[PDB]
Amino acid sequence: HVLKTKDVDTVFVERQKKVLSLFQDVDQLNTNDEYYKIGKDYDIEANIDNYTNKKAVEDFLKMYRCGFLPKYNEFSVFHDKLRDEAIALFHLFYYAKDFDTFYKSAAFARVHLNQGQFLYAYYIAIIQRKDTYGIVLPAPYEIYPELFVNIDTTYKMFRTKMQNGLINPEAAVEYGIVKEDNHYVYYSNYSNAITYYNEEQRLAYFTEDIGLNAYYFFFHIHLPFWWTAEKYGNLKERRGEMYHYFYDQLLTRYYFERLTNGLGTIPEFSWYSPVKTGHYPLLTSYYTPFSQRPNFYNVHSEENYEKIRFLDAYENYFVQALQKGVFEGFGQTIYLNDSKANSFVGNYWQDNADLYGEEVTKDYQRSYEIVARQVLGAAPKPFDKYTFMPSALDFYQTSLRDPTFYQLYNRIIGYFNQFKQYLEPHSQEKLHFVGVKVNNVVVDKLVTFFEYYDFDATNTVFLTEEELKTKYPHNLKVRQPRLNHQPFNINIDIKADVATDAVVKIFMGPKYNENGFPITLENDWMKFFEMDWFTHKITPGQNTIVRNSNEFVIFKEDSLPSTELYKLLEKGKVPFDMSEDFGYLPKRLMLPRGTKGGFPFQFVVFVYPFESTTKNLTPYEKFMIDNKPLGYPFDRPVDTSCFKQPNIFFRDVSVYHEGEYHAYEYNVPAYFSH
Amino acid sequence: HVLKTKDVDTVFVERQKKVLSLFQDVDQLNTNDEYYKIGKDYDIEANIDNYTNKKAVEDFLKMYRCGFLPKYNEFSVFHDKLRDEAIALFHLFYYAKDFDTFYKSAAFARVHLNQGQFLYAYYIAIIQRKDTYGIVLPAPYEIYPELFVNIDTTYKMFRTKMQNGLINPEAAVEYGIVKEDNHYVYYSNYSNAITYYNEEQRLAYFTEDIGLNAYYFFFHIHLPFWWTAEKYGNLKERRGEMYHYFYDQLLTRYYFERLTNGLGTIPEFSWYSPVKTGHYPLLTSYYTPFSQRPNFYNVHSEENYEKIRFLDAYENYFVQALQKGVFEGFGQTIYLNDSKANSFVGNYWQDNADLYGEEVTKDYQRSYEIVARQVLGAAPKPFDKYTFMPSALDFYQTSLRDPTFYQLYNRIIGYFNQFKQYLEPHSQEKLHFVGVKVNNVVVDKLVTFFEYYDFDATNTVFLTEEELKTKYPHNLKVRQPRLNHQPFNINIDIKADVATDAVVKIFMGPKYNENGFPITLENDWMKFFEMDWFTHKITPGQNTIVRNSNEFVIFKEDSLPSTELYKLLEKGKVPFDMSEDFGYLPKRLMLPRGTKGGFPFQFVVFVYPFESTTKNLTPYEKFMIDNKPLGYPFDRPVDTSCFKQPNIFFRDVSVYHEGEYHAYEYNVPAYFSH
Ligand SMILES: *[C@@H]1O[C@H](CO)[C@@H](O[C@@H]2O[C@H](CO)[C@@H](O[C@@H]3O[C@H](CO[C@H]4O[C@H](CO[C@H]5O[C@H](CO)[C@@H](O)[C@H](O)[C@@H]5O[C@H]5O[C@H](CO)[C@@H](O)[C@H](O)[C@@H]5O)[C@@H](O)[C@H](O[C@H]5O[C@H](CO)[C@@H](O)[C@H](O)[C@@H]5O[C@H]5O[C@H](CO)[C@@H](O)[C@H](O)[C@@H]5O)[C@@H]4O)[C@@H](O)[C@H](O[C@H]4O[C@H](CO)[C@@H](O)[C@H](O)[C@@H]4O[C@H]4O[C@H](CO)[C@@H](O)[C@H](O)[C@@H]4O[C@H]4O[C@H](CO)[C@@H](O)[C@H](O[C@H]5O[C@H](CO)[C@@H](O)[C@H](O)[C@H]5O)[C@@H]4O)[C@@H]3O)[C@H](O)[C@H]2NC(C)=O)[C@H](O)[C@H]1NC(C)=O
Ligand SMILES: *[C@@H]1O[C@H](CO)[C@@H](O[C@@H]2O[C@H](CO)[C@@H](O[C@@H]3O[C@H](CO[C@H]4O[C@H](CO[C@H]5O[C@H](CO)[C@@H](O)[C@H](O)[C@@H]5O[C@H]5O[C@H](CO)[C@@H](O)[C@H](O)[C@@H]5O)[C@@H](O)[C@H](O[C@H]5O[C@H](CO)[C@@H](O)[C@H](O)[C@@H]5O[C@H]5O[C@H](CO)[C@@H](O)[C@H](O)[C@@H]5O)[C@@H]4O)[C@@H](O)[C@H](O[C@H]4O[C@H](CO)[C@@H](O)[C@H](O)[C@@H]4O[C@H]4O[C@H](CO)[C@@H](O)[C@H](O)[C@@H]4O[C@H]4O[C@H](CO)[C@@H](O)[C@H](O[C@H]5O[C@H](CO)[C@@H](O)[C@H](O)[C@H]5O)[C@@H]4O)[C@@H]3O)[C@H](O)[C@H]2NC(C)=O)[C@H](O)[C@H]1NC(C)=O
Ligand SMILES: *[C@@H]1O[C@H](CO)[C@@H](O[C@@H]2O[C@H](CO)[C@@H](O)[C@H](O)[C@H]2NC(C)=O)[C@H](O)[C@H]1NC(C)=O
Ligand SMILES: *[C@@H]1O[C@H](CO)[C@@H](O[C@@H]2O[C@H](CO)[C@@H](O)[C@H](O)[C@H]2NC(C)=O)[C@H](O)[C@H]1NC(C)=O
């Protein structure tokens, strides 16, 4: 298995080395590095002429003169002042006229501002600036190891650094600390191996997967809720569509994990009754432990009365709109069938900038998602504007760790899917592909298994004044068994009458509901996970297509450590997926953990006429090369018909699991010591 | 102000240095230290002849061959397996025939067992073994810094050790990190300065005071609930009495702190309703954050049903016994007026070894306190016998930090005080001192203030292989402004007729109830804090006594750091209080924080005939040199009478507070950088 690579010129390579120079030992400053002197003395005001938007820069300065979040404090975009500062910072980076000005702005920021706040604006700037297009971003778990690994392993790294190596390596082995080459390897268990407070803990290997959590973080920075979608042209008009698609797919993939673990549908809750499934974040900030929500949390308390009425009202508005058939307010009147309706409900539920036709959201435009994450997070009200006790719901890089996160968005998509039933359902005629039939589909054996994976967690530790004079060590490694599956082929047999350009799509859906009974398309259309999307020319007669799972366009390869990036740059190359598909879901997680006996699911291949690509979303996600609504043909319900279309085929499939079933078994000392 | 000292011989000095050699860098093992070689190869089986009790040793070996709690895990005496192991370990220490066998056993333990478990059994053995009587114990906050200081300062020490010093001292100052001499000083705030989740936070300077918390730890190791009081001869028959006294005194003192902060009486709760006052420990173990209990915690959940029914039953039993006038069970039938009844209720509520007439409690003799701490701590059930998420209620060294601790014991003493109204109240004649009269009592100005206090927190950090080759650094200093007061005199005027040996006691009580109205002796007799106890020969005629607060026998001086202990040993001396009164409440806390305008209270002096001391508790606490019930004459209600005895005087008093009201103000960088 070789990793696909991409060629880049020298200018790119130089910029790449520059951006990465600001991603090292992030919680510490290195006066021996070039960026320090540059950032320390940089004069924004003096160079105001090197920014394309002066007002934006003057606002950053007016704001910066009043002080920003101090260093070491936790930064979160869900907190007003913190967000407003980050956005102003983003504008400073985004409006830089050229890479040079941008780099100096970033250098200035790294030196003078809070580490988290800078990293947040920096990551986004790199994604939005045209001149940095394609520049590879380091894996989020590499930059924020303290948000991707439980404290028990973070403290082990702290111990090692304080002792300056292992004092008794034979002993350290028993606690998962091993020395390989010049690296210190730490086997890190998911939380279910240390605390089992509720049945949801059985999903810890998935909900805590560093790839899965990185994926949500990337979803955010690719296009923040607080920013207009303007930059991506067409994406603006189709924003609500992308909102629905991202979440429905995420909720579905998560539901599949619940299914093979016998956990049923995503639980429903009430703002007026105790929230049943708690969560204990085994994470910590520099000032406090993350807030915990115990099982059966009494959410309806004095501290939340008003917030709960706001959330309830936000919901009533949407339910009442659906009932009277029209959305009123926000400067318009949209009937459910309006062509702008879909984006309106998505922008409404997210409370993003495009809902207001502005470029950035304001403080007073209260967000349903923000307040919900607030009361579900269970943290006491913030001490002040710069100080708060964080919860897993306060970060895009830790959200998928909390069960209520899926419960909250499932509630939101619940409303979205209700909206979908008022739309014109796909008719049988429109779904029918004349002259094209799928005679058969064969799927190789589906098998999952856990496989060790390492990532550089050196940012966890602080360096010595002497160490800062030499090259960064990239010394520590975190090792964890991560979900994976064996590659598999899907054989598609198509009998055609005439020759045409077709689009073939591949989905995975459940076979049975939570009670073990047959699925029903009328009620389960929203439970189909899109796995592949590609064009193919069909010739009259027999057509045989063979797609390997490794070719599925929806997924990406695992990120590489920043160190391996450097070696690849020496050859004028960068990892292909890491460069253009950083926001895709890791292909190793495309299949939910199976069972020893094999768990039932079903694949479905749908092929339709390839036509208009006038409003595609290629600038955002490469695989969105069509005019069809995202998720087609399962983007909305379909005109019920107990009679299948010839151009669609369902195949029963079973997902088995090899090796040890529990991930923690691979972290048992007696095992990894062989 | 000089500290009282005591002379010790050469044998004592040698034993003192030995015990202290095992209290260094406790979370780490030093192969260069003599104890490592001794301990690593000590063969208990081979020296089984060097133990006064062969059975206990064999039980230990039998248990040890099966495995003990692993190193680094949290140890708590409230968990069965952990306790039984700790107790077996204590027996191995206690039965050593001589100091030398004891020391070797200790070294063995230090090398082979869990650090927390070792320290616990070690601390107790030094207190219990006769040959170690007088040996000075190091401050608990110096041994368990991670239990006496919040993570924000712990993390600063970690960052310092990792950087191997300060990289930018000028910047460090802004985070309360300063360098003094060869020490790194860390200004540490109480939690109310970082998070204010409920009004009880206003009491953080008191509830988190290291001395107050150390005081509870000393109370416990002086005589564990799981051990018989046999060793202390007389105390055994008066154990229940001591229980009542200790908690009543502690609860009353805590009540005073509440009063000067406008927080009213200690809150009452129900096991069937949400617990109002939550608590967020800013502490952490090596594997998990301490459990948090949000405000209005839903305690009556499925996980606690059975435990709550047990707690209910436990209370029911007592209330029914009071109603029918008799305590049945436990191998006897006691009427409320029995002479052993007082000791029974105390032993019953604590579920101690003496309640059952055994030397140590068994796992199946379920405890009210343990189960109550369990449900109030709000932690999920333990992962397994060796792994649990700790709460402030799992340690005698952090218990007083949780508001529910006071609520729990206030509930208990609530029942104990109800039981006391069934007893014969003190008659006016037995309280009268014929011939003795207190004409007047004048109290000097009562003033409180905050004053910096340092302690060695180096145990927080891990030492380097090289650092272990040289002497321990005792490098880190934690600095916190701690409550204190100016010394004050109490002038007593006594007019006598005849000459007799008298006992004079000094109490402090409230002037008004929570609503600002006059106190009533009938309902507030249990609200008097004992401050002094001493004998005095009264001469006929005018008698003038002057007692300085520094002389009150109830309190002790602050502990000295281990390093100062060594210097003092060279002189063949040891702190007096630290050696003989380690269990007393630190005198700097005898007064609650006052208010700028002076908060109302009252002092009361009571003098009575000095006589019998046949059943005194001097072997336990020095100041208990009489036969009268602990807390006399406020140990039980008194035959209501409207004309006070001439040998008792009540004097109004005001407690003022000077300097900054809030402790955190003294940790503001602009302030301590002067
Ligand atoms: C415990 O607990 C407690 C309780 O909680 C705590 O306490 C706290 O603390 C804190 C901390 O410390 C605090 O805070 C702080 O404060 C401070 C002070 O303040 C003050 O002052 C200021 C200043 O002033 C000045 O200036 C101005 C302008 O701006 C003017 O106007 C004036 O006049 C003056 O002037 C003067 O001076 C100057 C100097 O400065 C000079 O120039 C001359 O001399 C002149 O003459 C000010 O500003 C203020 O003000 C304020 O306030 C007031 C009142 O009082 C008002 O009226 C006003 O308006 C203002 O504002 C306010 O208000 C508003 C509205 O209402 C609100 O919002 C609020 O309130 C505000 O505040 C005063 O007066 C200060 O300074 C600080 O600051 C800082 O931080 C912040 C945040 O927090 C920011 O924003 C800013 O910016 C800053 O930053 C900085 O720092 C930090 C640290 O901290 C860091 O992190 C950052 O990064 C930065 O850094 C920088 O700086 C520093 C210094 O500072 C240094 O060091 C550094 O350096 C380093 O690094 C670098 C890199 O980057 C390198 O290069 C080097 O090398 C190294 O070294 C840098 O440079 C703060 O704010 C508080 O307050 C407290 N609280 C209380 C209650 O008290 C404690 O802490 C604890 N403790 C423990 C241990 O834990
Ligand atoms: C993630 O997550 C996951 C999930 O959770 C986890 O996992 C986990 O893990 C853990 C840990 O690792 C584990 O545990 C462990 O295990 C192991 C194994 O086991 C097994 O084995 C054993 C042994 O065997 C042997 O022996 C015996 C006698 O005793 C016999 O009998 C047999 O036969 C064998 O034989 C052999 O022996 C030897 C070897 O060894 C030789 O001689 C020869 O070879 C011979 O042949 C056993 O015992 C066991 O048993 C058990 O099991 C079974 C079944 O399987 C059964 O049958 C039995 O009975 C038992 O069971 C049970 O019982 C009950 C139930 O009913 C209960 O009780 C329980 O369950 C039990 O178990 C098996 O088989 C082991 O080994 C370990 O141990 C340890 O630990 C403990 C606690 O934990 C204790 O107690 C003990 O004692 C021990 O300790 C140790 O270690 C530690 C650490 O770990 C520490 O801390 C301490 O201190 C100690 O130490 C020592 O040792 C070590 C080693 O071992 C070393 O290293 C050291 O050294 C050092 O130090 C010193 C000082 O001290 C110095 O001097 C030096 O230099 C240095 O080096 C020392 O020496 C444990 O137990 C588990 O299992 C798991 N789980 C699962 C589910 O899987 C993971 O971990 C995670 N990860 C992360 C990363 O986090
Ligand atoms: C008052 O609020 C209205 C409604 O939001 C604003 O009207 C909008 O103005 C923008 C230009 O900034 C137009 O693009 C929109 O089409 C307008 N919408 C509607 C419904 O009128 C108006 O600008 C605000 N008035 C002032 C003085 O700020
Ligand atoms: C049956 O119960 C009695 C009392 O409940 C047990 O006797 C006690 O035994 C312990 C020894 O562990 C002694 O320390 C106590 O003094 C005894 N008390 C009484 C009242 O007898 C007896 O051990 C139990 N039966 C068995 C077989 O253990």
Describe this structure in words.
This is part of a larger assembly, with two copies of chain A (674 residues). With 674 residues, chain A is α+β, with helices and mostly antiparallel strands. The first copy, chain A, has three domains: 1-189 and 452-482 and 559-572, no CATH class; 190-422, di-copper center containing domain from catechol oxidase; 423-451 and 483-558 and 573-674, Hemocyanin, C-terminal domain (Immunoglobulin-like). Chain A contains 23 helices and 17 strands. Chain A has helices at 10-21, 34-41, 54-64, 80-94, 99-112, 115-128, 140-143, 145-148, 151-163, 169-172, 204-207, 210-222, 239-260, 305-324, 341-350, 353-356, 368-377, 403-420, 428-431, 521-524, 562-569, 576-580, 669-672, and strands at 5-7, 177-180, 183-187, 326-329, 332-335, 436-443, 446-456, 476-485, 489-496, 500-510, 529-538, 541-548, 555-556, 573-575, 585-586, 599-609, 648-657. In chain A, the strands form five sheets. In chain A, strands 2-3-8-7-17-16-10-11 form an eight-stranded mixed beta sheet. In chain A, a hairpin with a 2-residue loop joins strand 2 and strand 3 (183-187). The first copy, chain A, is globular, with a radius of gyration of 25 Å. A molecule of 2 linked components (NAG-NAG) binds at residues 331, 357-358 of chain B. It is classed as oxygen transport. Keywords: Arylphorin, stability, glycosylation, Glycoprotein, oxygen transport.
